[PDB]
Amino acid sequence: SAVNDPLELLTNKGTHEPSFLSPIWNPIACGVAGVGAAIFINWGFRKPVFSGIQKHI
């Protein structure tokens, strides 16, 4: 295009493909954060770090 039209810059043509990590990054990062938080709780109480896996799940 030879014009710098402001309306077509915000209009989604649909040619942008989402990445492989885009729909699945936040649930697995928050799951790893929850598992690490349970490991941190078990470390702070001087429990074994994989004791009580129901809390991790």
Partner: protein, 368 residues
């Protein structure tokens, strides 16, 4: 207080005993379960004090079995040096550095001039303070009174007794006085104090009659140390505790009779001190409302880590109470890699524990 002989049988509780060693007592537990509904005349804290050779365990046992109370034994340093799994930490002494080795009362009996002794008495205070709250949790949560062979109010007598003989420096007195001024105002004073009076020579006679292998052939129990402690009892600790607690002097130079002192306890009227609100006697147990009673139960059944974290005074000016950093590092590497204390109690799989993959029960007031 009413004995078993006049009552004709055992006492009856006014309510169900709360499982204070299993269930916590927060404010949301204090909404439902009240604590003044299980109190009666046998809900007093009795401390049986005396010299070191007087029979106090047998007398406190027969007083607990006669007045229907629970006997709390005297504290000894086996409670630290033996863990929950039964392993003795005195076998780690060659691995530990010599400035951080074990120091029980046996090592005090042979070697009273060691640098660990100024730690040792403080450790004894940390076992009396930890016991009395464990006594108070039995009074407020179950209603049953307690009887104690030793009390943390009387532990300063031994501190000045080792000071006068020369076993402590002035800095050890300063740090013990700072710990006492930090901690002694947080626990309730006892209702009744029994002093089993003994002369200084009869204490030595009972010491040689007991024939315990470290009490004999020890220079600690001379004619000055025992005289210093029996003088120091009756002119500091008894004079301090008589403002709150009732004080009973018993001539224990004979074998001692039990029925006469139960008779002497039973004629004491406990309701005359509650007439005056601002009375000095039994001031710490004068709670006019149920909310103050529940606050007092919360302070010892739920805030015991606060009272145990009140021992965090920094005083680095003494050289005999500062553990050096390399010695502290190898002490951690020896003590916390033991079979007993690799993890918290109840979660050590090396000493026969199973089901750890689905176990998330920490416990109540457990030392980590």
């Amino acid at each position: 207080i009413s004995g078993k002989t006049m009552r004709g049988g055992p006492r009856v509780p006014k309510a169900a005993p709360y499982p204070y060693k299993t269930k916590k007592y927060s404010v949301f537990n204090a909404i439902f379960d009240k604590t003044s509904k299980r109190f009666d005349e046998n809900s007093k804290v009795i401390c049986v004090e005396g010299p070191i050779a007087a029979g106090k365990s047998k007398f406190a046992k027969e007083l607990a079995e006669e007045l229907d109370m629970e006997y709390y034994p005297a504290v000894d340093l086996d409670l630290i040096y033996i863990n929950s799994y039964g392993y003795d930490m005195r076998k780690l002494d060659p691995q530990l550095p010599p400035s951080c080795r074990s120091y029980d009362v046996r090592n005090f009996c042979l070697d009273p001039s060691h640098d660990l002794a100024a730690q040792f008495q403080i450790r004894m205070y940390m076992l009396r303070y930890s016991q009395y709250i464990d006594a108070l949790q039995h009074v407020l949560s179950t209603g049953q009174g307690v009887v104690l062979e030793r009390s943390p109010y009387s532990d300063f007598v031994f501190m000045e007794a080792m000071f006068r003989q020369g076993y402590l420096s002035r800095g050890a007195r300063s740090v013990y006085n700072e710990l006492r001024q930090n901690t002694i105002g947080e626990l309730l004073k006892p209702h009744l104090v029994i002093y089993l009076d003994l002369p200084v020579d009869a204490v030595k006679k009972q010491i040689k009659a007991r024939n315990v292998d470290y009490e004999v052939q020890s220079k600690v129990f001379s004619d000055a140390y025992l005289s210093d402690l029996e003088q120091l009892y009756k002119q500091q600790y008894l004079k301090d505790i008589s403002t709150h607690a009732e004080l009973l002097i018993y001539d224990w130079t004979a074998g001692g009779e039990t029925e006469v002192v139960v008779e002497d306890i039973e004629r004491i009227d406990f309701n005359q001190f509650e007439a005056d609100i601002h009375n000095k006697k039994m001031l710490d147990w004068r709670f006019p409302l149920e909310a103050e009673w529940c606050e007092a139960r919360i302070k010892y059944c739920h805030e015991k880590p606060d009272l145990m974290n009140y021992f965090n005074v920094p005083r680095f000016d003494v050289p005999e109470l500062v553990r050096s950093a390399d010695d502290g590092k190898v002490w951690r590497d020896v003590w916390f890699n033991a079979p007993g204390m690799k993890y918290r109690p109840g979660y050590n799989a090396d000493m026969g524990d199973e089901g750890l993959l689905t176990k998330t029960k920490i416990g109540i007031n457990q030392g980590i």
